[PDB]
PDB file of C-alpha atoms in Angstrom:
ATOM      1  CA  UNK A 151      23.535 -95.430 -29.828  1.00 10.15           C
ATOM      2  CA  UNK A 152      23.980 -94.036 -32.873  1.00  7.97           C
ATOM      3  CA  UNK A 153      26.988 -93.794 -35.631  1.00  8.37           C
ATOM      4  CA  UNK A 154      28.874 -90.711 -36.314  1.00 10.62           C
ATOM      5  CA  UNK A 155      27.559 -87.925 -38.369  1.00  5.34           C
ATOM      6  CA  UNK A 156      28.775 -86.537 -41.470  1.00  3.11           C
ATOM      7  CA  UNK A 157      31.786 -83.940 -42.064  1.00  7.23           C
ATOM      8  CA  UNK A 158      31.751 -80.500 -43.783  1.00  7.15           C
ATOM      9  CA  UNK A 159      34.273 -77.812 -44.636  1.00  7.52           C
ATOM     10  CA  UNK A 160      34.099 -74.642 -46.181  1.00  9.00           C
ATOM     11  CA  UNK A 161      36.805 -72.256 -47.916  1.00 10.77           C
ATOM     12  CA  UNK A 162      38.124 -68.876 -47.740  1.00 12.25           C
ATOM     13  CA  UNK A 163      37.593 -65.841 -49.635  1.00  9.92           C
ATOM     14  CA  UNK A 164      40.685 -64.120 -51.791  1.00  8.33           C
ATOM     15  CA  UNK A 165      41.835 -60.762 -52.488  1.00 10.48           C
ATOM     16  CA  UNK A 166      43.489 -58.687 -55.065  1.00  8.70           C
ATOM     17  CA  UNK A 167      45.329 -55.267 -55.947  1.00  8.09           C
ATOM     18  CA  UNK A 168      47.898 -54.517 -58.522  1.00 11.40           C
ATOM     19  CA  UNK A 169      50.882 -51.653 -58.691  1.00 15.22           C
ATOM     20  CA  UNK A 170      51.267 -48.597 -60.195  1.00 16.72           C
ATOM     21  CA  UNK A 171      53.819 -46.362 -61.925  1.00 15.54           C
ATOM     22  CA  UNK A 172      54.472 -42.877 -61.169  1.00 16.05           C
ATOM     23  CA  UNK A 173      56.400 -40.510 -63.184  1.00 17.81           C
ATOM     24  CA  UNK A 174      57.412 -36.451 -62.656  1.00 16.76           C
ATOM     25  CA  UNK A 175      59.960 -34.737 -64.599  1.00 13.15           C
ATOM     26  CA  UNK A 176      61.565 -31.070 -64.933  1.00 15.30           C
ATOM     27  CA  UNK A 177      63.665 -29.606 -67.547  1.00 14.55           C
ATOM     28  CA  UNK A 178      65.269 -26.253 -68.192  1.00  9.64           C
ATOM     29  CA  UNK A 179      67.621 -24.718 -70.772  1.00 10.50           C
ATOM     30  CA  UNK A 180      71.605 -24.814 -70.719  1.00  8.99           C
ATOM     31  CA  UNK A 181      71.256 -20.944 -70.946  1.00 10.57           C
ATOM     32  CA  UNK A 182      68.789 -20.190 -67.920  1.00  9.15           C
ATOM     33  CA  UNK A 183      70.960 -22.031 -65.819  1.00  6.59           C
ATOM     34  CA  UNK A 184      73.640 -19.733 -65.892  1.00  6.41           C
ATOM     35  CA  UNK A 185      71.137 -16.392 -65.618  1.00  6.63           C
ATOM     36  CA  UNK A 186      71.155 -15.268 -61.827  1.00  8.00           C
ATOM     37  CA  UNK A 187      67.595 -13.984 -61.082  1.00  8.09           C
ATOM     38  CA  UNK A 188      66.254 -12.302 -58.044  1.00  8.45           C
ATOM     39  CA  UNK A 189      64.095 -14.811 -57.148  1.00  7.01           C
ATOM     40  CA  UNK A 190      67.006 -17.831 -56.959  1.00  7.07           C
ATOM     41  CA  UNK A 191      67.970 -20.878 -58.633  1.00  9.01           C
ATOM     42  CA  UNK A 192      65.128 -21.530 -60.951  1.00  9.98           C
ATOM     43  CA  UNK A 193      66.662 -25.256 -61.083  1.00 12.76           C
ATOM     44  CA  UNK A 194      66.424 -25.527 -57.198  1.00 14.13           C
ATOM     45  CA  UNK A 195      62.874 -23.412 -57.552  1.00 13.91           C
ATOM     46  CA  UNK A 196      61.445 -26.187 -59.588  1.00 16.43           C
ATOM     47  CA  UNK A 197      62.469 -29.382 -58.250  1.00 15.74           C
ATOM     48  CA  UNK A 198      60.380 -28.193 -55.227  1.00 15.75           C
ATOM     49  CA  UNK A 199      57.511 -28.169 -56.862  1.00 14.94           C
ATOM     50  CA  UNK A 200      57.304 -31.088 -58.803  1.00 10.64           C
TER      51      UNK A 200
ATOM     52  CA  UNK B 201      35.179 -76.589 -32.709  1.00  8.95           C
ATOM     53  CA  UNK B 202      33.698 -73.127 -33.141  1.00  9.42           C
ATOM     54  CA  UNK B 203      30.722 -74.710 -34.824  1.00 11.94           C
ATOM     55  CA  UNK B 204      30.673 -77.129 -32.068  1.00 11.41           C
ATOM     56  CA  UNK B 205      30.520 -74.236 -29.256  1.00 11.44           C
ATOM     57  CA  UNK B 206      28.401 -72.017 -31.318  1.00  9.65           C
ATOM     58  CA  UNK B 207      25.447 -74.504 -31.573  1.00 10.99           C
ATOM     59  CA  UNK B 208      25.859 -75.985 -27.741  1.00 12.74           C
ATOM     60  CA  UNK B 209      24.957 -72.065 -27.534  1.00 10.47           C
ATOM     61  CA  UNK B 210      22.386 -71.689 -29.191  1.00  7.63           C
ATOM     62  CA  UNK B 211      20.553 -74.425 -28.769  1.00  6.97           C
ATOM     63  CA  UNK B 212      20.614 -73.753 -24.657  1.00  3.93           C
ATOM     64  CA  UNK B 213      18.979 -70.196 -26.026  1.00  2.88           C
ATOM     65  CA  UNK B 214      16.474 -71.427 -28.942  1.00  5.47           C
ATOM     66  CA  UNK B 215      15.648 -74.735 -28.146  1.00  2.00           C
ATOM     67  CA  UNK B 216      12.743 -77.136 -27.666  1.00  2.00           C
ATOM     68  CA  UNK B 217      11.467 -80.101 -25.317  1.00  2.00           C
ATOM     69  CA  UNK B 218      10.862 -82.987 -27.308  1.00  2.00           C
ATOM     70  CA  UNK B 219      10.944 -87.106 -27.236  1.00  2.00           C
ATOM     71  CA  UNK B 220      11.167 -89.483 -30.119  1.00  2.00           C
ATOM     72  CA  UNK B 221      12.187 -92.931 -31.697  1.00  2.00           C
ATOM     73  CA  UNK B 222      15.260 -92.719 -33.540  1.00  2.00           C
ATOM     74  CA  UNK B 223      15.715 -94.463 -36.816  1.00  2.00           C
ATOM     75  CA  UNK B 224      17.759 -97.934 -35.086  1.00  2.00           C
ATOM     76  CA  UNK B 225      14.498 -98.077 -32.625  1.00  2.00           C
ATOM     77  CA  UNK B 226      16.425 -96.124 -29.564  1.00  2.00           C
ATOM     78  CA  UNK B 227      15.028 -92.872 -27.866  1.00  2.00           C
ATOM     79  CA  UNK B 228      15.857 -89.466 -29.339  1.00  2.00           C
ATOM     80  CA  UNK B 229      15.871 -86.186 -27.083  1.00  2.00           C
ATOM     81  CA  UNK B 230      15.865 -82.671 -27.240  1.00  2.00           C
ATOM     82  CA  UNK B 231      16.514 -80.135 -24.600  1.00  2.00           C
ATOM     83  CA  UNK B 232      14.188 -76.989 -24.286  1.00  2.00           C
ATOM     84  CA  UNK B 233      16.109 -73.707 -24.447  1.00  2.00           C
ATOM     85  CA  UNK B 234      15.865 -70.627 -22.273  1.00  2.00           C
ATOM     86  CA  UNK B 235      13.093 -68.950 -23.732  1.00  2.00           C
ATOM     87  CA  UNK B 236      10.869 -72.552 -23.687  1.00  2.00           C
ATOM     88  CA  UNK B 237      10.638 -71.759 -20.036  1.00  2.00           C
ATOM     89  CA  UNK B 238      10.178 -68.108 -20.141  1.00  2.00           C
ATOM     90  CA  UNK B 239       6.228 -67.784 -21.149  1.00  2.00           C
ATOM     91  CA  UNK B 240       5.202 -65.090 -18.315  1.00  2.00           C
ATOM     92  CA  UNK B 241       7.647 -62.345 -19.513  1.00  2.00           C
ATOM     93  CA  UNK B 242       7.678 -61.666 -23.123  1.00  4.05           C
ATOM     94  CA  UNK B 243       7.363 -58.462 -25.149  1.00  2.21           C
ATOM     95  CA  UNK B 244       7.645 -57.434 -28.848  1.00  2.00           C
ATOM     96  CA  UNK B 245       8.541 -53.936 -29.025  1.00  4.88           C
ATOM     97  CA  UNK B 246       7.983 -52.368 -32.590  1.00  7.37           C
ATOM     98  CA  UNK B 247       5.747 -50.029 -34.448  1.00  8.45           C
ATOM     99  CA  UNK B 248       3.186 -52.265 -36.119  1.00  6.20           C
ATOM    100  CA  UNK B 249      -0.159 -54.210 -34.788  1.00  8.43           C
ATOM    101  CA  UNK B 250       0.464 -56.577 -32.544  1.00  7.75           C
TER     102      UNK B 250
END
């Protein structure tokens, strides 16, 4: 016939992560633009690869 | 609640026979678990004596 225990808890746990910037550029000259080449557009070219 | 179920559990797995006065002069009990009454079958399976 006894009384009623004690109560208890707990918490929980927390959790953290931040952001990031990213950057990628690509330049070329006025001049080379207007060159045709073999190969192609050295503008297009590049932009594919960056 | 889960602590509730999770030590009804174990204590019908772990537990011990026992009898005693409580503290306001009323009887105190304890069941036995499972492996109280298992005494016949029991092995310890590992690499050291014994």
């Amino acid at each position: 016939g006894s009384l009623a225990p004690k109560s208890a808890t707990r918490n929980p746990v927390k959790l953290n992560n931040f952001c990031q910037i990213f950057k990628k550029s690509y330049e070329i000259t006025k001049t080379a633009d207007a060159t045709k080449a073999r190969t192609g557009s050295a503008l297009a070219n590049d932009k594919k690869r960056r | 609640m889960f602590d509730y179920y999770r030590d009804v559990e174990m204590a019908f797995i772990y537990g011990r026979k026992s009898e005693t006065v409580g503290e306001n002069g009323k009887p105190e009990r304890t069941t036995g678990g499972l492996l109280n009454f298992i005494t016949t079958n029991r092995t310890q399976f590992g690499t050291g004596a014994g």
